[PDB]
Design a protein around this ligand. Structure first.
Ligand SMILES: C[C@]12CC[C@H]3[C@@H](CCC4=CC(=O)CC[C@@]43C)[C@@H]1CC[C@@H]2C(=O)CO
Lengths: 244, 10
């Protein structure tokens, strides 16, 4: 019933608190997304703590893991929402902030938007199930680690394997077909890294010139990014891939 | 990440 749990701790929908009466300038669009991100951050943290096995890890690791994977978690959840609500035609950031063709253009990050829409499309092509999605999401939280290692390395390794097995369980069907499914689903997981690399590059770029660009970031994000940025630029993080 | 740490340890 490990999934029964994943299903119960799955965060409730988060609204952007977006004001459509405002002009959709690049500044307002990005600042609004950053606000949504701050609100989603709170939800991912509360979700992580309720994750069977996450609390067994050292606090330092818990901090490090969320710090390195928050962008991937949110982009992936965005992929799912866009899949269930628009069959992947639009980015369902939040019920009150749906990105259509127009907002993608005025956002100044059209390409990153398409990259994110591509994840949504994969969900469509593969008809990913809700259970597969929940398991994959957890794996994401456990796929970007410090090159030097975690403090609860052993506790970490066990947890990761358990969720990988949980994914297999979600995956009736014959053995070969289940193998092919696993291969394809883990290919999707590995693809997140390139997408995230690009998402993070723009995030760091807008973060550095925040005031000069008039792109706002909520306090919680400012602290996370401020600490994370140098670590990423220093190549301190590495992905845990499923494929060559 | 002050706000985050405080949120994770409670
Ligand atoms: C960080 C970001 C705004 C926030 C989003 C992120 C892309 C992924 C994402 C998905 C969500 O469901 C919440 C918003 C968000 C976290 C964007 C990547 C570039 C953009 C900016 O850099 C704006 O300054």
């Amino acid at each position: 019933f490990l999934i029964s749990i994943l299903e119960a701790i799955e965060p409730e929908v988060v609204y952007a608190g977006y004001d459509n009466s405002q002009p959709d300038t690049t500044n307002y669009l990005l600042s609004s997304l950053n606000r949504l991100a701050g609100k989603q951050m709170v939800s991912v943290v509360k979700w992580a703590k309720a994750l069977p096995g996450f609390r067994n890890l050292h606090l330092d690791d818990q901090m490090t893991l969320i710090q390195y994977s928050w962008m991937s978690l949110m982009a992936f959840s965005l992929g799912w929402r866009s899949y269930k609500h628009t069959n992947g035609q639009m980015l369902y950031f939040a019920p009150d902030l749906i990105f259509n063709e127009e907002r993608m253009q005025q956002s100044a990050m059209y390409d990153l938007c398409q990259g994110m829409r591509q994840i949504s499309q994969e969900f469509v092509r593969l008809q990913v199930t809700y259970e597969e999605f929940l398991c994959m999401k957890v794996l994401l939280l456990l796929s970007t680690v410090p090159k030097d290692g975690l403090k609860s390395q052993a506790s970490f390794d066990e947890m990761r394997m358990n969720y990988i097995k949980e994914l297999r369980r979600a995956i009736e069907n014959n053995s070969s077909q289940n193998w092919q499914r696993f291969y394809q689903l883990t290919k999707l997981l590995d693809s997140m890294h390139d997408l995230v690399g690009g998402l993070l590059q723009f995030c760091f770029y807008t973060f550095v010139q925040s005031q000069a660009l008039s792109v706002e970031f909520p306090e919680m994000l400012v602290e996370i990014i401020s600490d994370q940025l140098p670590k990423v630029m220093a190549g301190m993080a590495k992905p845990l891939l499923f494929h060559k | 990440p002050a706000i985050l740490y405080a949120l994770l340890s409670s």
